[PDB]
Structure formats: C-alpha cells, structure tokens
Amino acid sequence: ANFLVHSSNNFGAILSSTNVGSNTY
Amino acid sequence: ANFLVHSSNNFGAILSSTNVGSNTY
Amino acid sequence: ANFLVHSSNNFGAILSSTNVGSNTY
Amino acid sequence: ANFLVHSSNNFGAILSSTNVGSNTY
Amino acid sequence: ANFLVHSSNNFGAILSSTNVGSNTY
Amino acid sequence: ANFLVHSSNNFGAILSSTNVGSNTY
Amino acid sequence: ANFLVHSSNNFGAILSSTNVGSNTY
Amino acid sequence: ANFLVHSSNNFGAILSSTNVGSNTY
Amino acid sequence: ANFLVHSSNNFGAILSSTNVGSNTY
Amino acid sequence: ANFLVHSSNNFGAILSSTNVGSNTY
C-alpha cells in the first residue's frame, strides 16, 4: 500500500507493483 | 496508495505502479 | 492516490502510474 | 489524485500519469 | 485532480497527465 | 570533439559533455 | 571524438561523455 | 571514438563513456 | 571504438564503457 | 571494439565494457 524505497546508484529498475489484475512486463 | 520513494543518482527507472487492470511494459 | 516522491540527480525516469485500465510503455 | 513530487537535478523524466483509458509512451 | 509539484534544476520533463482517453508521447 | 546528435520527441536530456576537469551533475 | 546519436521518444538521458580526467554524476 | 546509437522509447540512460582516467557514477 | 547500439523500451541502463584507466559505478 | 547490441523490454543493465585497466562496479 505505502512502500518505502531508498536507492543509490540505481542502474536497473525497481518494480514494487501491487497487482490485483493481470499484466505483462 | 501513498508511496514514499527517495532516490539518488538514479540511472534506470523506478516503477511503483499499483495495478487493478491490465497493462504491458 | 497521493504519492510522495523525492529525487536527486535523476538520470532515468520515475513511473508512479496507478492504472485502472490498459496502457503500454 | 493529488500527487506531491519534489525533485532536484532532474535529468530524465517523472511520469505520474493516473490512467483510466489507454495510452502509449 | 489537484497535483502538487515542486522542482529545482529540472533539466528534463515532468509529466503528471491524468488520462481518461488515449494519447501518445 | 565534433558530436553529431539527432533527436525526436526528446523528453529528457542528452549529455555529450567531454570532460578534461571535474564537474558534478 | 565524433559521436553519432539518433533518438526518439527519449524520456531519460544519453551520456556520451569521453573522459580524460575525473568527474561525478 | 565515433559511437552510433539508435534508441526508441528510452526510459533509462545510455552510457557510452570511453574513459582514460577515473570517474564515478 | 565505434559501438552500434539499438534499443527499444529500455527501462534500465546500457553501459558500453571502453576503459583504459580506473573507474567505479 | 565495435559491439552490436539489440535489446527489447530491458529492465536491468547491459555491460559491454572492454577493459585494459582496473575498475569496480
């Protein structure tokens, strides 16, 4: 619901997707 | 719902997508 | 709903898209 | 609905798009 | 609906587009 | 030295900085 | 030396920095 | 030396840095 | 020397750094 | 020397670093 993310020198991706339906990446 | 994100030197992407339907990336 | 984002030296992208329908990136 | 964004030295893009329909990027 | 954005040294773009239809970027 | 850049629908930034000293972004 | 870059719908950043000294991002 | 880059829907960053000295990201 | 890169829907980073000295990421 | 990279839906990073010296990641 309420996500706490701290990053440093991020080269890739951060996925914090809370899903109730369908999806593709 | 209410997402707290702190970043530094972000080169990539941050995805915090809360999904109820469908989507593609 | 109400998203709190703090960034510094952002080179990429921050996606905080709350989705009820469909979309592509 | 009401999104609070604070940035500094933003080189890329910040997408806070709340979607009810379809779109492409 | 009512989006609160604060920025500093913005080099890129900030997209806070709330979408009900279709669009491209 | 002589940089050839072609762009279209640029939302972010393009950095082609050739550096001999120090700098921060 | 002479860099050929073609882009489309760029949301982030393109860094083509040729470095002989020191720098930070 | 002469780098040929073609991109589309770039959300992150492209680093083509040719380095002879030191640097940090 | 001359690097040919083609991308699509890049969310992270592409590092094509040819190094003769030292550096950190 | 001349590296040919084609990608699609890249979430992480691609490192094609040709090294003659020392470096850390």
Author numbering:
A (entry chain J), B (entry chain H), C (entry chain F), D (entry chain D), E (entry chain B), F (entry chain A), ...: 13 to 37
Article passage:
In this study, we outline critical insights from hundreds of grid optimization efforts to uniformly distribute helically twisted amyloid fibrils formed by the human islet amyloid polypeptide (hIAPP) at physiological pH. hIAPP is a hormone peptide associated with the β cell loss in type 2 diabetes. It exhibits diverse polymorphism and has been a particularly challenging study case for both solid-state NMR and cryo-EM. The human islet amyloid polypeptide (hIAPP) serves as a notable example, as the majority of reported structures have relied on the use of nonphysiological pH buffers, N-terminal tags, and seeding.
By applying the proposed strategies, we have resolved the structure of the dominant hIAPP polymorph, formed in vitro at pH 7.4, to a final resolution of 4 Å. The enhanced ice coverage and the abundance of monodisperse fibril filaments observed with HEPES buffer facilitated the determination of fibril structures formed at physiological pH. Notably, over 80% of the particles corresponded to the same polymorph, with only a minor fraction representing polymorphs with longer crossover distances. The resolution of the reconstructed 3D structure after Bayesian polishing was determined to be 4.01 Å based on the Fourier shell correlation at the 0.143 criterion. The final map presented clear density for the majority of the peptide, which enabled the construction of an accurate model. Cryo-EM results also undoubtedly show that the N-terminus of aggregated hIAPP is outside the amyloid core, and instead forms flanking regions that are exposed to potential interactions with monomeric rIAPP. The double S polymorph observed at pH 7.4 is consistent with previously reported structures from both ex vivo and in vitro studies conducted at pH 6 (38,66).
